[PDB]
Structure 1
Amino acid sequence: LPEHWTDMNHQLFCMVQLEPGQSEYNTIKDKFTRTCSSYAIEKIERIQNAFLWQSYQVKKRQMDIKNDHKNNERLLFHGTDADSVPYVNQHGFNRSCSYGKGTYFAVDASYSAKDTYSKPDNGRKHMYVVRVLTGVFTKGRAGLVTPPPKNPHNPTDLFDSVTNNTRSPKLFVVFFDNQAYPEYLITFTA
């Protein structure tokens, strides 16, 4: 449904390799090279997953209504191993597969570039650029299974995400499916 997606022959899922030197590739490469200029990019792919996008956009609309502002989305990074890539492309990020038991996303590509996250393949590494509905956030802590409530006497009204540091966040954790949309996959080497 986004305007910049290309035609999919009436299908619902496609990975589209970006053309180097065009505006879309350049924009994503720049976000990566801001902190990972010593790495070599092999390719960048746009993830066109209609079902995942639809469920994510429903959640975004709901969060925009609940927070009655539209500053709920951030573009973050997520490094993972090659064996998780097919699952993420098709199903997104699953907390069931410390600041809480959720899925973690980094502000800086350099954080996700650590081998503990983007585990090397032939030494190929994989990192997603992710639209994340961080919404209203608070500091996380170990053992959380959802974000904390905003106020005790209303324990069901929750923060949207948690972070390591509210003033200068470097990571965010989300605890529900469809709060994160994998937008691009970067394949790269050290």
Structure 2
Amino acid sequence: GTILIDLSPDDKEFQSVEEEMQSTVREHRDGGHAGGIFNRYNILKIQKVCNKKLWERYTHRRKEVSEENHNHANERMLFHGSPFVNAIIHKGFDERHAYIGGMFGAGIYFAENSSKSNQYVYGIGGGTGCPVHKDRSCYICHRQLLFCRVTLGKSFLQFAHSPPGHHSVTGRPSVNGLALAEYVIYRGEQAYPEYLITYQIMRPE
């Protein structure tokens, strides 16, 4: 029951998402083995997701978390990359498909940095890469990330479910020497995929 709203490149909504996409790119210390080598993206499409039923599922849970956290939902816009993006925009987020082998338990992981979620679009650690060329650093095939609303509530700083009294877990693991933040929820209701971003990484040369 979802419909997608095509945003024009000359739109403030489009540009803020585009900006947050480009500005949050980091220089991963794994030589781009996971997500590929790039500085910026070639942003092809940014579609806003509309689903009243899933939005009501979210705002309902958001209110519940606010009450449990001194009326502070701790709402944040975060990126999510996975091969199941197109399933999520219709069925919503679902903890029953959570990353079981995750560092912070079976949950739904997000990131501050767009480039960090990019490492998970084709699978954990990039998987085998794109379906056609089997290249984790493919500059041809289009990729898709979600730019979601995320109710963190009272987040627990660590280093399955949420620890007691909390609603999410915030980490900052140092992969290959660089520390970047992570965010995990253990209930799909605490996230709404607001924007679907179709893009591709640019060959830096």
Structure 1 and Structure 2 fold alike (TM over 0.5): yes
Task: Read off the aligned partner of 2:115 and give its amino acid letter.
Answer: S
Choose the corresponding residue for 1:148, options 144, 163, 169.
163
Superimposed CA distance per residue, residues 75-123 of structure 1 (whole angstroms, 9 cap, x where no aligned partner): 1000122xx2331111222222211101001011110112xx1124561
Please say if residues 132 and 179 of structure 1, whose CA atoms lie closer than 8 Å, have aligned partners that are also in contact: yes
Separation of aligned partners in 1, 2:154 and 2:112: 16
Q: 1:105 aligns with which of 106, 110, 115?
A: 110
Does the 8 Å CA contact 1:163/1:169 hold for their aligned counterparts?
A: no
Separation (CA, whole Å) in 2 of partners of 1:169 and 1:85: 22
Aligned to 2:96: 96
1:160 alignment partner, one of 140, 146, 167: 167
Q: Secondary structure at the match of 1:55?
A: helix
Is the contact made by 2:6 and 2:46 (CA closer than 8 Å) also made in structure 1? yes
Correspondence for 1:27 among 16, 31, 54: 16
Higher RCO (C-alpha 8 Å, min separation 6): 2
Distance 1:138 1:165, change over 3 A: farther
- Percent of aligned pairs sharing the same letter: 30
Give the aligned partner of residue 56 of structure 1: 58
User: Given the two structures, how large is their TM-score scaled by the length of structure 1?
Assistant: 0.79
Distance (whole Å) between structure 1 residues aligned to residue 69 and residue 24 of structure 2: 31
Contact 2:79 2:117 in 1 (8 A): yes
1:71 is displaced (CA, Å) by 4.6
| Aligned match of 1:138 | 156
Structure 2 length as normaliser, TM-score? 0.73
Cα distance between partner residues in 2 of 1:182 and 1:175: 16
Q: Distance in 1 between matches of 2:90 and 2:70?
A: 31
Q: Residue 169 and residue 139 in structure 1: after superposition, are their counterparts in 2 closer, same or farther (change >3 A)?
A: farther
Q: Which residue identity does 1:188 align to in structure 2?
A: Y
2:136 — aligned with what? none
Q: Which stretches in structure 2 are left out of the alignment for 5+ residues? A: 26-38, 98-102, 123-129, 132-139, 174-178
CA distance in 2, matches of 1:63, 1:71: 6
Match of 1:77 among 73, 79, 103: 79
Pick the aligned partner of 2:121 from 118, 123, 137.
118
Matched position secondary structure for 2:96: coil
Is the CA contact (8 Å cut-off) linking 1:75 and 1:130 kept in structure 2?
Answer: yes
- Asked if structure 2 preserves the Cα contact closer than 8 Å seen for 1:47 and 1:89, the reply is yes
3-state secondary structure, aligned to 1:96: helix
Stretches of structure 1 that go unaligned for 5 or more consecutive residues are: 1-11, 150-157
- Structure 1 or 2: more strand by fraction: 1
For 1:41, the equivalent position in structure 2 comes to 43
Question: Quick one: distance in 2 between partners of 1:39 and 1:29?
Answer: 9
Select between 43-52 and 28-37 the one with higher mean Cα deviation. Answer: 28-37
2:146 counterpart residue number: 128
Q: Which residue of 2 aligns with 1:184?
A: 195
